[PDB]
DNA sequence: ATTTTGTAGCTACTTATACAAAATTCAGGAAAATTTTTCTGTATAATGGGAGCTGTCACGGATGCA
């Protein structure tokens, strides 16, 4: 019941990385980040949020691939 | 024989009214002024803590068991 450790163990069991490895990331993260602030721009202008579909981005995208792009983009940060 | 009592009386004479605006102040507002609280960034690199405590009990459990 150490709690501190009870979490500390586990984090152990996720393993450390290196700049290069954390570079694929960076891009992806940004790729997701900005994408959203589309999502906010389109928000703020209108309906308060694209937040529909492939139009939940004003951007163009084959919709399934959108959510996907989102996943990888932010999964990087996670 | 004045004096006090009078009566038949007023006029002066003064509250009383009520209003009344004028004061005359007060309160609240409004700022506005400003002071105090918040917010955000920070680029070499940095990647598991602290402690110890060590002398009843009980019981019911004790599942666990061999």
Swiss-Prot record:
**Which compartments is it annotated to reside in?**
Cytoplasm
What residue ranges are annotated as transmembrane? none
State the family named in the UniProt similarity comment for this chain: Belongs to the sigma-70 factor family. RpoD/SigA subfamily.
Q: What does this protein do?
A: Sigma factors are initiation factors that promote the attachment of RNA polymerase to specific initiation sites and are then released. This sigma factor is the primary sigma factor during exponential growth.
Q: How does it assemble?
A: Interacts transiently with the RNA polymerase catalytic core.
This protein's name: RNA polymerase sigma factor SigA
Its source organism is Nostoc sp. (strain PCC 7120 / SAG 25.82 / UTEX 2576)
- What lineage does the source organism belong to? Bacteria, Bacillati, Cyanobacteriota, Cyanophyceae, Nostocales
- Gene transcribed to yield this protein: sigA
Whole-protein coverage range: 79 to 156 of 390
